[PDB]
Design an enzyme around this catalytic site. Structure first.
Site, short mmCIF file in Angstrom:
data_model
loop_
_atom_site.label_atom_id
_atom_site.label_comp_id
_atom_site.label_asym_id
_atom_site.label_seq_id
_atom_site.Cartn_x
_atom_site.Cartn_y
_atom_site.Cartn_z
CG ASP A 290 118.30 46.97 39.12
OD1 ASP A 290 117.78 47.45 38.60
OD2 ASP A 290 118.50 47.28 40.27
CB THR A 291 116.78 39.59 38.32
OG1 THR A 291 118.55 40.29 39.58
CG2 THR A 291 117.98 38.17 38.35
CB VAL A 296 122.39 41.90 37.01
CG1 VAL A 296 121.34 42.75 37.42
CG2 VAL A 296 122.44 40.14 37.63
CE1 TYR A 299 122.39 46.33 29.38
CE2 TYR A 299 121.53 44.92 30.98
CZ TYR A 299 121.82 46.20 30.16
OH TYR A 299 120.48 46.26 28.65
CB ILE A 371 121.14 47.65 35.67
CG1 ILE A 371 121.46 46.82 36.06
CG2 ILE A 371 119.53 48.03 34.51
CD1 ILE A 371 120.51 45.03 35.83
CG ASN A 373 120.31 55.01 38.64
OD1 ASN A 373 119.54 54.36 38.02
ND2 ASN A 373 119.98 55.44 40.43
CE1 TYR A 374 118.88 52.32 41.88
CE2 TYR A 374 118.33 51.42 39.42
CZ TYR A 374 117.96 52.43 40.34
OH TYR A 374 116.96 52.70 40.13
CG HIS A 425 119.23 48.70 46.60
ND1 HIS A 425 119.48 49.24 45.04
CD2 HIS A 425 119.25 49.95 47.93
CE1 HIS A 425 119.49 50.31 45.15
NE2 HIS A 425 119.01 51.04 46.36
O1 LIG Z 1 117.41 49.83 37.29
C1 LIG Z 1 116.71 50.59 36.84
C2 LIG Z 1 116.68 51.86 36.38
C3 LIG Z 1 117.61 52.67 34.96
C4 LIG Z 1 117.17 51.77 34.29
C5 LIG Z 1 118.46 52.38 32.91
C6 LIG Z 1 118.80 53.84 32.76
C7 LIG Z 1 118.10 54.30 34.27
C8 LIG Z 1 117.56 54.49 34.98
CU LIG Z 2 119.20 52.89 47.95
#
Ligand SMILES: O=CCc1ccccc1
Ligand SMILES: [Cu+2]
Ligand SMILES: O=CCc1ccccc1
Ligand SMILES: [Cu+2]
Ligand code: NA
Ligand code: NA
Lengths: 620, 620
Positions: A290-291, A296, A299, A371, A373-374, A425
């Site tokens: 993610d980073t 990150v 977003y 990002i 779903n998270y 994670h």
């Molecule tokens: O964390 C990244 C996985 C992800 C990124 C963008 C859309 C859905 C899922």
């Molecule tokens: Cu999880």
């Protein structure tokens, strides 16, 4: 006038002007990263030079560039073309999120897969997922995203409840080409909706919760000057913001008497990775940085008063660059407030008759990023007593799949037909330490058990042992909860009044590190995640535990390459890298939206002060 | 009308009347413990019988008695004389605190030791410390306290800053006799004061803290009925109070739809021990069972609004018996309030456009106790999402000694000449579980790492394994932070909508357990503390992990003897005993009064609900 001030919109605009004039920002260029550089060591000149680093992508196939610019002098300082097959691809662009779905929507192989499942192409969302590096030789040096599909029954539907399993596609997002479509079999698309705002799912909302009002009738106890400089209850620091890392803390110091004592020079979450534990070829490639891959900070959410941050909130609105170099404000992107934190110290003494109670409080600095779903909240806490704590709050919607008929060892069932693959994670905190200055060292402290015998006749004694880490090659450490293992960062040249070196103790949560097989692609690309603690000698260009270009990099860069230099770290300018994370076996209660779960670490003074630093706190 | 209601002053008075009439409360008797008995299993008769258990001490040498009384029928149900050499001594009496100092003040050996140190007897406080069981054959069946001395320079002086090392005495507190005085050498009495209210030590108090106002303009969201029955945000429970254990939680249940689901039948801290790690003969005997020997509930503080408990506070004032059977109110002894707890769940969805944020809160139930130098807060937390958490907050003044010239492996230096021996604070939580009813089982869950190979070609898969504990002899478990070990309590006869057994997961902090040598007196007396988790079959008389009479008991009673029955616990009425604690290497910052440090555990639903139980929480 502070060199640690946030980037301004005018600085962003000047950077764009400079790049444009140099011929580096043509209509086919995109800025994939823009951030201010920290001052080099030895800022005692005050020759302020505001420098920015820029990653410049080319949508037409030309090689991307890394560019350093000085807004202070209005010049390009350096510009290098990147061989991405060697050093890695640039981070994912926001505008590439949509491209995966659109390229697939015209591909005959994709349409054949959807038609077999009776899915209308107009309802199918495709998640734009980082590719990693695996066995597909044709991807080397190409900019690839992978796509997994989810059905939206209507535009406000939660697509995550309807994963399309057994199907995955790979897309070259520059040449605009679908390289592979893999259909391993049809799975029923899970039918239940996961719409957590539907009254039919929520039922009648509770009417029992009564309001909690948190106010500060006289204002908050901290002050903000120069835009981002904080003074609170003897703490001093600067709050930075970087589009890759998010909130960064600079110059953390504590006013002890008349003297400003440094503690931490720079603190950040320098990387975070989410590896998935499902061996299905549909998902076994799935590891999101993610980073490093998505950035990150770009977003970050706008945080709403009363909902996201409650009480007397002071906001920062950091400025970042869009893909064309225009400034964009993240309004209310950072919340700052102090919170009551219960009892600080308490004693009723049988012999003196004195009853003593003091209350604790903490300064909170936080942002929230989304990002896909998270959703993650990043919280830094400063306490009255010198403790520094970090806490990550993980929420959002879990990543879903079909639940195989006949069960799974690697996937949890959330609803009929609907699964959630196991994952982790994992975070990397980069702590550029400055305990009373830059001559620091790290000691590993273990509890020592003693055998009953001479000198210990009653078998009650126990002790502790400290081992100095003297070179980088011995400074890769594992947790040991059983022996109460912690790490102390001290300054051997700065002693407290008892003539012991001043120090801070790192207390880890001792959660499992990276579970993947050590021979896996993810264990090579996320090597930092295989161990709890790393110590390096500081160097300007050693910023991320995974290296500068994580996307599709084949592995090894970052920490394993840094520590190979085997530099002296015994009383030197050092950096602590702490790995910590959550291992997530999803539960039914995580569906259809996840209650927050947390992980973190903290640092507490260890003979830093000459006595309790909170003797001067008054009664409430 | 609830059988779980708190004891009333009238009930206490009736108990005293009954004991008096029976000839059991003569002028030489003292009540050392008085508490209500929980209803026996199968209360479905509602034949309410309020029964009380009483320990009756005799200050004249006669054998003490254990007595069960029924206030409902006004009769003595049973009365047994105790052979204390066999089953252990009664808990320490508050009135014995002063007796140690007074007996020593006339003893010629004690006076000779003090005169050698030039200490005025009128300035010397003597701490009344539990004796344990060691090598002194003459103590068997005698009621012994040990004494360590501290100098008070003036009546408001903190004596803890002036320990008298190298000196200890043993006192038979019934025959009023000093059995031994041991002087192992003179140590300087540390001279610095530790008076944390002295302006000369605090300096000018801070003027920078601004008030945080927490109010509930509409009142709190919970309701209290029948004196101690709580309803809050679908939680239901009764708050009990016992002079030995403190706050006890009964009948913890959660209203899921129209149905009240049990979770925990009885939760308490059933024991807590503080073993010291200094091999000096002055202190090597030192292990205090605050709960079992001293009774933590009788030292509960009166909690002050605004200082101890902040916000909209509802108090309980529990009633206990004094040594003569008179009722005494602990005014404002228990605080109850709800607290904001940040973000509960949050998601901004790229595809639906829905932005969702909900806030969390927790119900807090707490009391604070003071036993000599130590002060402990006991906090129970109930969260919106079904999580139950316990947190102990340790503060007060550390136990001190001289710091030996030339250092120590077992003592920290706090100030010139002043030391703080290493010790632990170890708690035992007793969780009488009732997950959806009384047919429960415990599973040990470990993360499973998988090797790269067939079925796992990319080496990313990982899994989990669950092992059912089926008999008591296999239900003594150790932590393993490395494998993410947790324990799940489930009901194999109650399934969620996915046809899996409903459950709750215990998440431990994985701190070190008892460090003492396994052959030591303390390892035998506190056997519960050597392992993280024990599971027993429920039985009425198996209340404490150390047995009923901890004081001077020679060891083995409690959990090691219970589990020897090897009873079936696979789908039965079971009790979970969780050991957790702090290992305390005192730091300079702990002096002269300790900032709070914490330890605890939590339980989270694990497929107990059919989906997130907080979908019906409204926006703020
Ligand atoms: O964390 C990244 C996985 C992800 C990124 C963008 C859309 C859905 C899922
Ligand atoms: Cu999880
Ligand atoms: O926790 C018990 C140790 C103790 C008890 C009473 C006075 C001082 C110290
Ligand atoms: Cu302690
Ligand atoms: Na450093
Ligand atoms: Na039970």
């Amino acid at each position: 006038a502070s060199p640690f001030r946030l980037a301004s919109a005018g600085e962003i605009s000047e950077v764009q002007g400079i790049l444009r004039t140099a011929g580096l920002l043509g209509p086919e260029k995109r800025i994939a990263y823009l951030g201010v550089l920290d001052p080099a060591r030895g800022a005692g000149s005050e020759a302020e030079d505001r420098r920015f680093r820029v990653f410049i992508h080319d949508v037409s196939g030309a090689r991307p560039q890394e560019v350093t610019v000085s807004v202070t002098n209005g010049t390009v300082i350096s510009a290098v073309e990147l061989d991405t097959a060697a050093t890695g691809e640039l981070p994912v662009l926001e505008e590439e999120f949509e491209v995966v779905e659109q390229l697939l929507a015209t591909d005959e192989r994709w349409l054949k897969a959807l038609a077999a499942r009776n899915l209308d192409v107009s309802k199918v969302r495709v998640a734009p997922l980082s590719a990693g590096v695996f066995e597909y030789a044709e991807e080397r040096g190409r900019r690839i995203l992978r796509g997994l599909a989810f059905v939206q029954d209507f535009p406000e539907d939660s697509a995550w409840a309807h994963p399309v399993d057994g199907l995955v596609a790979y897309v070259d997002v520059v040449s605009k080409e679908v390289t592979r479509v893999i259909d391993t079999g049809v799975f029923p698309v899970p039918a239940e909706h996961g719409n957590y705002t539907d009254p039919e799912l929520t039922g009648p909302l509770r009417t029992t919760q009564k309001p909690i009002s948190i106010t500060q009738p006289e204002g908050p106890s901290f002050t903000v000057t120069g835009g981002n400089h904080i003074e609170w209850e003897k703490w001093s620091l600067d709050v930075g913001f970087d589009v890759r890392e998010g909130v960064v803390l600079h110059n953390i110091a504590f006013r002890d008497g008349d003297r400003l004592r440094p503690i931490i020079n720079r603190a950040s979450i320098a990387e975070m990775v989410v590896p998935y534990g499902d061996p299905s070829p549909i998902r076994s490639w799935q590891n999101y940085f993610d980073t490093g891959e998505y950035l990150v900070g770009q977003y970050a959410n706008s945080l709403e008063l009363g909902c996201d941050c409650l009480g007397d909130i002071t906001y920062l609105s950091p400025v970042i660059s869009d893909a064309f170099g225009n400034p964009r404000e993240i309004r209310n992107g950072i919340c700052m407030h102090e919170e009551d934190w219960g009892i600080l110290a308490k004693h009723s003494d049988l012999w003196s008759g004195i009853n003593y109670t003091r209350r604790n409080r903490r300064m909170v600095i936080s942002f929230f990023t989304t990002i896909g779903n998270y959703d993650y909240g990043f919280y830094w806490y400063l306490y009255l007593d010198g403790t520094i704590e970090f806490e990550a709050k993980a929420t959002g919607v879990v990543f879903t799949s079909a639940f195989p008929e006949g069960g799974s060892d690697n996937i949890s069932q959330l609803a009929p037909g609907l699964g959630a693959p196991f994952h982790q994670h994992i975070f990397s905190a980069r702590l550029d330490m400055a305990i009373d200055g830059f001559t620091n060292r790290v000691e590993e402290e273990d509890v020592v058990r003693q055998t009953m015998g001479p000198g210990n006749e009653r078998g009650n004694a126990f002790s502790r042992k400290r081992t100095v880490l003297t070179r980088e090659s011995e400074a890769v450490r594992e947790a040991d909860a059983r022996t109460g293992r912690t790490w102390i960062i001290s300054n051997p040249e700065s002693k407290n009044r008892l003539n012991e070196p001043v120090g801070y103790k790192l207390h880890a949560h001792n959660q499992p590190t990276l579970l993947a097989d050590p021979g896996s692609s993810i264990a090579r690309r996320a090597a930092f995640a295989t161990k709890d603690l790393w110590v390096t000698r500081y160097a300007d260009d050693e910023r991320y535990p995974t290296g500068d270009f994580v996307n599709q990099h084949s592995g090894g860069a970052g920490l394993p390459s840094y520590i190979a230099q085997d530099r002296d770290i015994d009383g030197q300018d050092i950096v602590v890298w702490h790995t910590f994370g959550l291992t997530h076996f999803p539960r039914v209660e995580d569906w259809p939206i996840m209650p927050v779960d947390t992980v973190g670490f903290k640092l507490r003074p260890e003979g830093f002060f000459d006595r309790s630093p909170v003797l001067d706190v008054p009664a409430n």
